[PDB]
Design a protein around this ligand. Sequence first.
Ligand SMILES: C/C1=C\[C@H](C)C[C@H](C)OC(=O)C[C@H](c2ccc(O)cc2)NC(=O)[C@@H](Cc2c(Br)[nH]c3ccccc23)N(C)C(=O)[C@H](C)NC(=O)[C@@H](C)C1
Ligand SMILES: Nc1ncnc2c1ncn2[C@@H]1O[C@H](COP(=O)(O)OP(=O)(O)O)[C@@H](O)[C@H]1O
Ligand SMILES: [Mg+2]
Lengths: 72, 371
Amino acid sequence: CDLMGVDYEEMAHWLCHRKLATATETYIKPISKLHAINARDALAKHIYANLFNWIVDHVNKALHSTVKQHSF
Amino acid sequence: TTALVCDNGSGLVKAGFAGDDAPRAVFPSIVGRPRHQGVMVGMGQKDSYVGDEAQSKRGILTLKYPIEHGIITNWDDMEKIWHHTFYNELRVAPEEHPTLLTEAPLNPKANREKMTQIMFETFNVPAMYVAIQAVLSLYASGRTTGIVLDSGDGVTHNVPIYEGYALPHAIMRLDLAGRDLTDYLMKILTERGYSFVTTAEREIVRDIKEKLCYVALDFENEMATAASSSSLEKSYELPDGQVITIGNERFRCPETLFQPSFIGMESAGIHETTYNSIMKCDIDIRKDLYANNVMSGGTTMYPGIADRMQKEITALAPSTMKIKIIAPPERKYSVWIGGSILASLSTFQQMWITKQEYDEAGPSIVHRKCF
Ligand SMILES: C/C1=C\[C@H](C)C[C@H](C)OC(=O)C[C@H](c2ccc(O)cc2)NC(=O)[C@@H](Cc2c(Br)[nH]c3ccccc23)N(C)C(=O)[C@H](C)NC(=O)[C@@H](C)C1
Ligand SMILES: Nc1ncnc2c1ncn2[C@@H]1O[C@H](COP(=O)(O)OP(=O)(O)O)[C@@H](O)[C@H]1O
Ligand SMILES: [Mg+2]
């Protein structure tokens, strides 16, 4: 939470629960320790995959040049 | 193509697409007709209203519920409610999507025959299936073993299941209901001087039952407490802004589930029918049924019904044998969530009734394939 800035109480709350919502109502539901672990690992995989896609977008920003590509 | 998942009942209709996390269309299942002489000209007077429209206008209308006790008791209004569900409220043509439909167990066969006939002929749905509510509750709660207790408006039923096999001889059904709790609430409310006669008043009584009732943990102790003291007594605001005060009665209303003798039936309450259903199961599984009790449907939403059930079963069950009650907060929707899970499964895609099989076998096929 310090490294990311997100406030400790919000991470501690959301890691141990998930939210359902119909359009009219919303339920905060507890989840098993196994499902909590699966969700934490899915969040780590999602962060890493987006960091990889971002670093590739910057590499592309360096590699591109303005002239319109006719064929490749 | 995503199948539709539709769960009918007395009370709310719940519909949405399979694979969604929660139902997309939820609305009370009512068909309403005007009962006053329309005086204005060019009003745009309409033959009848469905769902939320009938709720808003309701002061003008006779409200009729087309399903009582999980049986469809006039097919024209039910077909209107499906028409409203597919075209108005999901806005998706049924000719694209398989459909999954939900029924209480031990219903008449004709209800499934007519419901499939109307789906194939009148909506041209390419494929359909009919699931049991209790089975779907297990998918929703994430289990393959347990005794489900599911109680909505209309039917209350227990279905024990053990590693994915039902036990038909142990299935129990009861006609205690949100609805009979409502009619009891009106008849007891009369005691304090408040008389709710018309159907649109019954909807008010239903909203009082939702907001203010709670299941007394020990009945006679809270009766004595409410006799002794105001502290238990709480008040509510009718739509016109009058206030009404309701006392001990607010706990008196949901106990009738535990003591049907109040409304006048003799069959024992949901705790003792749960125990009797377990006892109808063979002796080796019973530990696992006691380990899992899964509540479902809106009539199990009352505060303290989970703890009152756990206590009173523990009093019935042998003292060593661990009793657990599993009441998830979402449980009002869990029959839909289970239907969504089931319809999403790849193995299920084998198991739809298809239109060709209907044309070959006629509407009796449902008994063969579905259950
Ligand atoms: C707005 C509502 C209630 C009220 C006006 C709200 C107020 C707050 O209730 C009271 O406490 C007042 C009072 C009353 C009078 C004496 C008494 O020792 C206790 C109460 N009781 C009444 O005015 C009764 C009398 C009555 C008729 Br006739 N038959 C009935 C059959 C059974 C019981 C009683 C009756 N009364 C006319 C109504 O309920 C009307 C029909 N009720 C309604 O339209 C609905 C929408 C709710
Ligand atoms: N929080 C609540 N407490 C008590 N009763 C409720 C609550 N919410 C809904 N109900 C009642 O439960 C019934 C609806 O049950 P439900 O299972 O949702 O209907 P359906 O059988 O159509 O799915 C209605 O009588 C409704 O008034
Ligand atoms: Mg139901």
